């Protein structure tokens, strides 16, 4: 719900995962990890 960080304090009544400073980080890591797996299986085409 709430989180205190280094210099900043983030509070949401619902969730912090839906807060942008987090949400963007979560979304970026989720996709970056999924592609890495796709790359490990070689499913990534050279001309994409």
């Amino acid at each position: 719900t709430s989180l205190i960080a280094s210099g900043v304090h983030y509070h949401h009544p619902d969730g912090v995962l839906f807060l942008t400073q987090f949400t963007q980080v979560a979304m970026a890591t989720v996709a970056a990890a999924q592609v890495a797996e796709m790359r490990e299986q070689g499913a990534f085409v050279e001309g994409a």
Binding site: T1, S2, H11, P13
Partner: protein, 48 residues
Amino acid sequence: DEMAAMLLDLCTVETKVAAAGAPVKVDLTGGLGDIKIDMAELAAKARE
């Protein structure tokens, strides 16, 4: 009636939001904490 009023004041919008951010510990005591009154006597004798 006095103590009831003290309990409602914790239920006010101001102190409600305070509880949402972090647990609120309220002392509703009348200063019985720094009391130097000896309970071995003034309580027992009262009861006796």
